[PDB]
Write a protein that binds this ligand. Structure first.
Ligand code: HEC
Ligand code: HEC
Ligand code: HEC
Ligand code: HEC
Ligand code: HEC
Ligand code: HEC
Length: 158
């Protein structure tokens, strides 16, 4: 018999999530999660990220105190939701967006989903759009973060 295996959560329309028994077993024993938090049966009891904020499922520990909050860092549990360096193909060459640099100042919620969706290429914007406050322009306005009005080389390889 082998230890419980890594669990895969299949969601239609959403990037799958994963749970590592091995990693958590380095900290807990079976009864700390079974059966108050999760059952031992193949019986589903599907939860939402909301239920988690309400202390259920992964949220029982991933609350910002016991373990990192399940409200952010989606890429830690959702492999497909991993923030990466983005490259845009524009009419004047490539433009880039580095998540890592921004993650040293903001949390996922600061941009997702009010400003951007977790999907590149969704709502394309022109620099003019940005100058009016859209896309990067929401912050890069020369008052909060540096403006998009000049120093194109900051984001462009022209
Ligand atoms: C919380 C940190 C856990 C600890 C410690 C252990 N398990 Fe676990 N287990 C946990 C989760 C999040 C899940 C997924 C539940 C889901 O909604 O799909 C599981 C699943 C299992 C299963 C599979 C049962 C099934 O869904 O049909 C088994 C058989 C199981 N866990 C066994 C098990 C044992 C023996 C543990 C101690 C060695 C153990 N788990 C610890 C969360 C956690
Ligand atoms: C690990 C602690 C997680 C973090 C952090 C995030 N999510 Fe998650 N998500 C996780 C699991 C195990 C599941 C499935 C739970 C189940 O019982 O099946 C999910 C599910 C979702 C869903 C579908 C349900 C819903 O609330 O709509 C979505 C849309 C989803 N997760 C999105 C998401 C985002 C955007 C996150 C960061 C802001 C995020 N998750 C973090 C586990 C974890
Ligand atoms: C309490 C019994 C927990 C439950 C239930 C779940 N997790 Fe957990 N998780 C817990 C701790 C104490 C930690 C370590 C501290 C930290 O915040 O990192 C974690 C860590 C993880 C991680 C990151 C691991 C790493 O490489 O550092 C992930 C990806 C993770 N946990 C996912 C996860 C999911 C998907 C859960 C619900 C299915 C879940 N955890 C439950 C404590 C507990
Ligand atoms: C604003 C400063 C951001 C923060 C903070 C985070 N993300 Fe992000 N993300 C941002 C942009 C501009 C885009 C492009 C959207 C578009 O319309 O093209 C994205 C895109 C993503 C995606 C999909 C592409 C990818 O990077 O793989 C994901 C999966 C994503 N972002 C995840 C993510 C997570 C988990 C964050 C916090 C840890 C996060 N983003 C923060 C801008 C910003
Ligand atoms: C980062 C803060 C930027 C600065 C500074 C400038 N641009 Fe930009 N530009 C950036 C991105 C990420 C994108 C793609 C946006 C998308 O939704 O796809 C672009 C795109 C353009 C485009 C194509 C779209 C259009 O406006 O027609 C052009 C022609 C362009 N950018 C030119 C440009 C010039 C000349 C700049 C300095 C005056 C400039 N950009 C700055 C991000 C950023
Ligand atoms: C507010 C939530 C922001 C969004 C949305 C985007 N950026 Fe940003 N960016 C922001 C800050 C606060 C900073 C730090 C510097 C400052 O102006 O105070 C940055 C920094 C960058 C950089 C790197 C600058 C450097 O370290 O030299 C670049 C090139 C940049 N940002 C580009 C960029 C693009 C293309 C964005 C839209 C896809 C984007 N940022 C959104 C704040 C915010």
């Amino acid at each position: 018999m082998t230890p419980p295996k890594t669990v895969n959560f299949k969601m239609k329309g959403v990037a799958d999530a994963a749970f590592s028994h091995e990693f958590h077993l380095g900290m807990y024993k079976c009864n700390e999660c079974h059966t108050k938090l999760f059952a031992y049966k193949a019986g589903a009891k599907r939860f939402t990220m909301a239920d988690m904020d309400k202390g259920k499922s992964c949220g029982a520990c991933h609350n910002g105190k016991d373990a990192f909050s399940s409200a952010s860092d989606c890429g830690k549990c959702h492999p497909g939701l991993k923030p990466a360096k983005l490259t845009y193909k524009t009419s004047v060459g490539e433009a880039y967006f580095d998540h890592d640099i921004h993650l040293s100042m903001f949390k996922c919620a600061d941009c997702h989903t009010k400003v951007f969706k977790y999907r590149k290429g969704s709502a394309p914007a022109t620099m003019a759009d940005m100058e009016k406050g859209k896309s990067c322009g929401v912050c890069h306005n020369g008052k909060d973060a540096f403006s998009v009005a000049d120093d194109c080389v900051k984001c462009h390889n022209m």
